[PDB]
Design a protein around this ligand. Structure first.
Ligand code: A1L60
Ligand code: A1L60
Ligand code: 11A
Ligand code: 11A
Ligand code: OCA
Ligand code: OCA
Ligand code: 6NA
Ligand code: 6NA
Ligand code: CA
Ligand code: CA
Ligand code: CL
Ligand code: CL
Ligand code: CL
Ligand code: CL
Ligand code: ZN
Ligand code: ZN
Lengths: 382, 382
């Protein structure tokens, strides 16, 4: 039936709210009003889906969630993890987009920003399990999620990342992951946990869901005991240079996966060799783009508004090859780095910068069809 | 005390809310965060004030309000006017910025956008009165506002307009003044008339103030009988080409007043000769700028986002002279048209386009100091 034999799953980044989980008025993550990625690709007979995972969660939490989004079932963050960081072991339960998913039946994964990292970690679990959970179920018995076992191979065909901060971002180091702003993010999570809320910002495993019979004051009190406030098991940390490195150190190349990356630049070189945001950089990334572009290390300055170019091209100590826009991106085992997209900012990739006339919908539709083509190629070269 | 012998009054345009009449979070009309016009000019020892008049009212209503803003007293729209259009004769009562205002004590008037038109009409009344009101107080006796008398001369030194649609705007013709959107504007006015509201959008004379003991349902009912819904005595109409023409036809040059205009361009010529908004044009003017720039008459296309250049330069049927930036603008009796400011949009003039880094505060401060200088010149060349 569908033109693509393996389904394509699009994995949003940090703060990503998609589908039924967005506010009443809110931009549409995958494509904005420029190109309705899911709807349009479907009209053209491609099987495509958009995952919904934790907007504020760590990559670990998101990676677990992603698995359950595809496979269906009750999120199991694993007993050891839960115990280490101090959050619920079990989480939401998902219908499952592909309940038969197992070695043999494959999926294409494309991830925007932090979605890139999430995809990589999930494949890690599939192939090589989770050591701490294997170890814990060794010592203490019990049931273990298959996700954490290892040996599940031949389940992901491609990993493709749009503006992913593979090597982290100064924006996280010097802003996002600071004390003051973590407290804000957590407060937002606390609030949207109120008994009148219909959105899930993704930190409920930490106890940010008010019980229907509990006062807001008791809620505040209950939840201020949560480890979330001082924990590292959260998105803000995973986006730092340290945080991202950790994930790099614990991942490896799957030689049957077709790995490909895209990158944007949206800064320009200023008086002293520092980088400043172009007019056209979506305005909410103004300050981050300046923090990044004023980095002491010079090669860390060119940025797309929140991710510097070094960070996006490839995870820094993994194999990569520079690639052409015309040549087929068909090499397994190595990070095929597509040429930098001049004047695309972080959010241009998902078409939500309605302020930027220079980034037209027909352009964005080419880009996504581009990606589907590459994917079709991967399918045809097995 | 003050470096300027005659006070400078800045008159905001359509939708203009200033001072104590703005919402909790709301941009500051005169200068935004770029250059606090009123506060800064004062720090440098200039006597300057910001008028507060009807945001949605006709030029007539605003002109009357302006007079009372300066002079102090209870707004009197005049009995014949009130009767003709079908709205309260009396309105808010103003403390008075300048209680002694009379021939001999003069004021400098600078108006942004529709503020330009309002200033023109008020001076007309001062000099040549209102015929309808003269006539009606003839037939039916009573008291008459001094504004409508005529013969009050030598009271305004200068009229200076920033991006005023002297000849109206297609944006009004094809959008602002349509049936559907007038109804929206009026609903907003109706709502902000509620008994919990602290802002005055300027249409209360039409009955849009809920009485403290009246239900919202009775309010809706009472007010749906108001002439406002189908009247022309409103801003949206006065901003149309017809509407603006009417004011042109009934105004004339006072040869002791120093008339000066500024204009912005913020569109660029496309493939087929039509004009499109530059990146940098404040985003709320996107659609208007396209409507204007796609006009059949070609000379009506270059625009600042909502006002086409033909409209801003000078009222089309009145005397004007092109001027240089250095040429001191000191000619009485004729519209001294300053050279177009390239890449200034409608709102750049008042510094509220926080999205536009290209428009710096130091630039805006020069422009305003510019204006004060010209005014000082007018003072010194009497
Ligand atoms: O700040 C971002 C970030 C990314 C990575 C890192 Cl590492 C960091 C860090 F480190 F600094 F914290 C920060 C995340 C979100 N930012 C703006 C969000 C846009 C928003 C939007 C976009 C897509 C949607 F589906 C829904 C809403 C929106 C709002 C209003 C609107 F009119 C249009 C769009 C861009 C970058
Ligand atoms: O729409 C406008 C118009 C003008 C003339 C005509 Cl003729 C027509 C018509 F009729 F054709 F439709 C329409 C009026 C106001 N528009 C945008 C409002 C700006 C707003 C602002 C401005 C001044 C303030 F003191 C405070 C806020 C604001 C909002 C948010 C923000 F982040 C910054 C500024 C621009 C043009
Ligand atoms: C009859 C009064 C209800 C008007 C409709 C809603 C207005 C909002 C009231 C604001 C507030 O209570 O702070
Ligand atoms: C408050 C000034 C009038 C602007 C109306 C047009 C804007 C609607 C387009 C949607 C958007 O703002 O993204
Ligand atoms: C991110 C802001 C959410 C918008 C709230 C407006 C709701 C409404 O008026 O229906
Ligand atoms: C098109 C109507 C505009 C008001 C609501 C949209 C706000 C948003 O961009 O989320
Ligand atoms: C940009 C429109 C301003 C209208 C003022 C208000 O809604 O209170
Ligand atoms: C928070 C983003 C700016 C305002 C968006 C809009 O009015 O469409
Ligand atoms: Ca952009
Ligand atoms: Ca601008
Ligand atoms: Cl939210
Ligand atoms: Cl499995
Ligand atoms: Cl919830
Ligand atoms: Cl009121
Ligand atoms: Zn966790
Ligand atoms: Zn009136």
């Amino acid at each position: 039936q569908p033109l693509n034999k393996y389904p394509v799953v699009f994995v949003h980044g940090f703060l990503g709210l998609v589908g039924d989980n967005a506010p009443a008025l809110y931009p549409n993550y995958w494509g904005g009003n420029k190109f309705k990625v899911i709807e349009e690709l479907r009209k053209q007979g491609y099987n495509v889906h958009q995952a919904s995972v934790s907007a504020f969660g760590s990559n670990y939490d998101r990676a677990v969630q992603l698995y359950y989004y595809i496979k269906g079932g009750r999120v199991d963050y694993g007993a050891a993890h839960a115990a280490k960081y101090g959050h619920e072991r079990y989480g939401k339960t998902y219908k499952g987009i592909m309940p038969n998913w197992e070695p043999g039946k494959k999926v294409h994964l494309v991830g925007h920003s932090m979605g890139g990292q999430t995809i990589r970690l999930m494949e890690e679990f599939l192939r090589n399990g989770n050591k701490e959970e294997i170890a814990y179920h060794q010592a203490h018995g019990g049931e273990i999620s298959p996700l954490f076992t290892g040996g599940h191979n031949n389940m992901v065909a491609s990993i493709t990342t749009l503006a992913t901060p593979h090597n982290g971002s100064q924006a996280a180091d010097k802003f996002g992951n600071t004390e003051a702003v973590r407290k804000i993010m957590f407060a937002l999570n606390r609030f949207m946990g109120n008994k009148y809320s219909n959105i899930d910002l993704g930190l409920t495993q930490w106890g940010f869901k008010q019980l229907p019979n509990e006062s807001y004051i008791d809620y505040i009190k209950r939840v201020s005991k949560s480890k979330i406030w001082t924990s590292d098991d959260n998105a803000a940390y995973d986006l730092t240079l340290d945080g991202s490195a950790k994930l790099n150190n614990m991942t490896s190349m799957n030689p049957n996966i077709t790995y490909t990356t895209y990158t944007g630049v949206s800064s320009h070189t200023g008086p002293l060799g520092y980088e400043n945001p172009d007019l056209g950089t979506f305005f909410l990334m103004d300050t981050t783009s300046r923090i990044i572009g004023h980095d002491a290390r010079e090669e860390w300055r060119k940025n797309d508004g929140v991710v510097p170019v070094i960070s996006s091209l490839h995870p820094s100590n993994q194999p990569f090859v520079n690639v052409t826009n015309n040549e087929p991106a068909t090499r397994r085992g190595i990070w095929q780095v597509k040429p930098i997209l001049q004047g695309w900012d972080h959010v241009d990739f998902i078409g939500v910068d309605f302020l930027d006339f220079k980034r037209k919908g027909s352009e964005l539709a080419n880009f996504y069809i581009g990606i589907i083509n590459d994917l079709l190629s991967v399918e045809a070269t097995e």
